[model samples]
Target chain A: MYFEIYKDAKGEYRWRLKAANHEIIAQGEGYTSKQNCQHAVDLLKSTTAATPVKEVL
Target chain B: MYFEIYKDAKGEYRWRLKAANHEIIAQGEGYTSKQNCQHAVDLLKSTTAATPVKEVLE
Candidate 1:
């Protein structure tokens, strides 16, 4: 899985992770900082494939 | 997978993506700006990624 972080309307950060085929895996918004967005991605790459929980928004 | 970005000794930005063992899926360095780091990540997210590649170094 992979993700991309982009700024939203509120200057807040958001993230997205998708399968290799471009299918969505997880997504999140409202990060207070860029580093936080990166942290979210790290959390996702390690957990999204291992955990049963859905969505990390 | 997922990643973490941090500053290196050279004051350059770098990243790492962690999986089961946090096996290094991808990495890059020498970002001129913070936004460049983020853009590099977006590029990686869409592609280390998709094209069977490795290493985006500073």
Candidate 2:
């Protein structure tokens, strides 16, 4: 998977995680700054691998 | 448009914003708690209407 950062129609910086097949599987909240958006992506990249999956009942 | 709350394959709670055409336009980070996921959605809902758009270089 890879992170694709771009501007949404609203002109806000946004990032999305695309699978190998080029499907968007996840995304982040909009940010006023691209740098801030990238920071969010970096944070998710660093923490998500170790994030545990729990069933919500 | 509406917010869709669901569980991904990882079983983590997640949310996405879908347009009237049913296309997923935006999404949120995974959350461990469903309540947290809803909070994220609500937060987005409250702030997004007034959010300004800016042009990005790339």
Candidate that would win on DockQ: 2
> Quick one: best TM-score, which candidate?
2
Worst 10 residues of 1 chain B by lDDT: B49-58
Give candidate 1's error at residue B26 in angstroms.
Answer: 1.9
Q: DockQ of candidate 2?
A: 0.10
lDDT of 1 by residue, A1-55 (tens): 5555677776776665556786754445455767666654554343333322111
Task: Give the alpha-carbon lDDT of every model.
Answer: 0.51, 0.59
Best-fitting candidate, measured by lDDT?
2
Candidate 1 chain A: minimum summed lDDT over ten consecutive residues — where? A48-57
Q: Which portions of model 1 show Cα errors greater than 4 Å?
A: A1-57, B48-58
Clashing pairs for model 1 are A1-B1, A45-B1, A45-B2, B29-B58, B30-B58, B47-B50
Residue B43, candidate 1: C-alpha displacement in angstroms: 1.7
Least well predicted 10-residue stretch by lDDT in candidate 2 chain B = B47-56
Q: Mind giving the per-residue lDDT tens digits that candidate 2 earns over A1-57?
A: 456778888888887555568785545877787777765544444432223333335
- Model 1, span B7-44: residue lDDT tens: 77777665555456857543455665666666555544
